[PDB]
Amino acid sequence: GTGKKEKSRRIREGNLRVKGENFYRDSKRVKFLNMYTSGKEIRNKKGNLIRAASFQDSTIPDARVQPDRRWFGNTRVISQDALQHFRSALGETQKDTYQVLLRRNKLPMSLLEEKD
Amino acid sequence: EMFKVIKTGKSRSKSWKRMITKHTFVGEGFTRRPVKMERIIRPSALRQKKANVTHPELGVTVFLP
Amino acid sequence: NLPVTVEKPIPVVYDLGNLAAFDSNVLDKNDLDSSNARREEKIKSLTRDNVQLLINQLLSLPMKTTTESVGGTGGQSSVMTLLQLPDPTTDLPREKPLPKAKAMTKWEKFAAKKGIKPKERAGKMIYDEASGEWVPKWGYKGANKKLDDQWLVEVDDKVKGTDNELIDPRTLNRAERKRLVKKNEKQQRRNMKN
């Protein structure tokens, strides 16, 4: 059947396509499913290393931190007004049993948790 | 050195899982991936939340999150 | 001690974001015509009542206070108390249309197809192993133009046998760089045409 050919399917719906990309799988699906068989090393007849295993490269990286003035600046600050607002809000909360915590806000809780 | 190969299967024939041998910081709201889709492993014993930070000025060390 | 409670038959509406008050009461043509000498008094009284209502609403609006001192950025000092105006209700036409969403370029489509994530762009400083300094990878005094200033360049083996052997390799590399830049500009113009 000419209509069932892989060439004809692409017309209905070059170097970009990868091996195994078909009607059922896209390129990302192909690579994610190849993850389960990925982690193997390749060796030749002489025993050399054609390709190292995944996440097992033996090369020593050059670990340096460049000089920069972004390291010495303040990253997080809070105003006195914001501190007062959050201190007042901590205490007025009426927790409902049917409300769940999806994401907790990042706050200076050491500065906010002051109790007489 | 960073990663350790973790073998799966009854005959230990698959070797696609990797375990980080160094200490890590995972952050807030961390949940473990499902085991079938968990390639990178950061064991809970090696997760860190606080550090001993020395201030150059005033010469003190404080345990900070 | 005049009253400050203006009573109105038809209830007026407010747009405190625009600082506007609209009353749709009954206006007589006789008291407002130019033939009447009291038209100014009538209009002044009506506007006075409406302004009193608007001022009542504005001064009953919530107020923002701060504790920062003067001389700092923000414009509001400790002594200043500012009314919190709500969003404007009345709709007005824009002066220009909304910015259209630009169509994806060829690079963007290719990167989406092949799963190429954007670069982190931490900085433009690269470490030089031949020296002991961090240098810019491009631009003013960049490391991409050090071949022009290089004191000694070895001649490539593949250049021999062609008439381009006599040419300065620094000139050849500068020409290749300019050709690449013009190619990038032509690709940008092509994307803008598409």
Add this chain to the structure above:
Amino acid sequence: QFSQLHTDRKQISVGFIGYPNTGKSSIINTLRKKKVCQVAPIPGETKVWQYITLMKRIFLI
């Protein structure tokens, strides 16, 4: 509802915990409408964890 609240997570997991012989395996079998977890009147039938796929985005443990 929990899946809709975590619609950006691509899947959620629901872990069943409690005392022995309270019926976690029975509840999972009830949700699947099939005996996918072994059940016994004796305590300690379940000995390790087990993943069950209830829907495409919902896993039970």
Add this chain to the structure above:
Amino acid sequence: SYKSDQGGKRLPRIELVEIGPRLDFKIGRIHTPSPDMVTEAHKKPKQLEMKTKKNVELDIMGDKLGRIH
């Protein structure tokens, strides 16, 4: 503004002094836009405002909260 003696110290009595100009406009001629232009001019950007989601609120502390029925 003047002291009112009946609205406390919060609601002053207002008075208007005209400063001009005083104008009378007779409505000579009109020219109204096309409805598609009206809609295009009244479109809103909505980029800045947070998207609304059912059963998801933000409390006073800033924590995102989900409701369960």
Add this chain to the structure above:
RNA sequence: GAGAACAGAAAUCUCCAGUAGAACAAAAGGGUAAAAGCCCCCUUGAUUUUGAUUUUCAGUGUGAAUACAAACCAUGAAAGU
């Protein structure tokens, strides 16, 4: 336009007149003159970092790009930019 050895049609200095006829960008039918032109001073940070916010991606879901805002930063006596 006049004056000043080389030095005249062209070198450099001085005075008066000088709506820009100069030099910068756009293609004004009203762009800029104690400048938007020329010189001097300060900054080399400009790919900062924070975000429950906008859009996209991820088997590494509190990360990154991206849009917007804010805190800063630079300069100035300041208004401010």
